[PDB]
Amino acid sequence: KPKEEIKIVEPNGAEKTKLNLNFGVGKLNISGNEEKLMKGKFIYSENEWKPEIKYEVKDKDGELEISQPGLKSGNVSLNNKRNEWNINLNEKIPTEIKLSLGTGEFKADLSKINLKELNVGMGVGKVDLDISGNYKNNVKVNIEGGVGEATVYLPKSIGVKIKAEKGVGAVNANGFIVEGENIYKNSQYGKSKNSIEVNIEAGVGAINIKQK
Numbered sequence: 001k002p003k004e005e006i007k008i009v010e011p012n013g014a015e016k017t018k019l020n021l022n023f024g025v026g027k028l029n030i031s032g033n034e035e036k037l038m039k040g041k042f043i044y045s046e047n048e049w050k051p052e053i054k055y056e057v058k059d060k061d062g063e064l065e066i067s068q069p070g071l072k073s074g075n076v077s078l079n080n081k082r083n084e085w086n087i088n089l090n091e092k093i094p095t096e097i098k099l100s101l102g103t104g105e106f107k108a109d110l111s112k113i114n115l116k117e118l119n120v121g122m123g124v125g126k127v128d129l130d131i132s133g134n135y136k137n138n139v140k141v142n143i144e145g146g147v148g149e150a151t152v153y154l155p156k157s158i159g160v161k162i163k164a165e166k167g168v169g170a171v172n173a174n175g176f177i178v179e180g181e182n183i184y185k186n187s188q189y190g191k192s193k194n195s196i197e198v199n200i201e202a203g204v205g206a207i208n209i210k211q212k
């Protein structure tokens, strides 16, 4: 039986959330649908993977950090082990998210979050992100992957521009306007007051961009 834990964070004066996640291996799932700042359920089969949470409010910014203890490691055998983080985030508070993911699968619905910035690094694995919200300010998204696939869902209603670069692999961007070298946009870009600027880099793997 793996360990299971719930963690709940109240804002305690924060007016912005800065979420910083360091995740070595496994499955990370993020959504909205939380009343407090964040609620998470963490499942881990190895005691060494026990997540470490730090939260402080500095000058109205709630700095929330969640880290899987590094295994500096030689080998880890993954069969029959489990490491899963399932996180629910507040939908109203202005939010920046930074993720460093070693290996595994990252899935996030951020369409209901008051998102300002997202930075994702992934070593080996998959990223699937719904950032198709009607955001009420400009949004900056940076995604960088080593080996694996990244899929991003973007809104039709606000302007989007994506710079998508791969080493070896394909950019699948049907229904987007193609601009010169590695730039993709929707029809709203340049027209809506608000926009999402997206940079996506993949070493080896596919980049799939879709409107939703």
Ligand SMILES: [Ca+2]
Pocket: 144
């Ligand atoms: Ca870099």
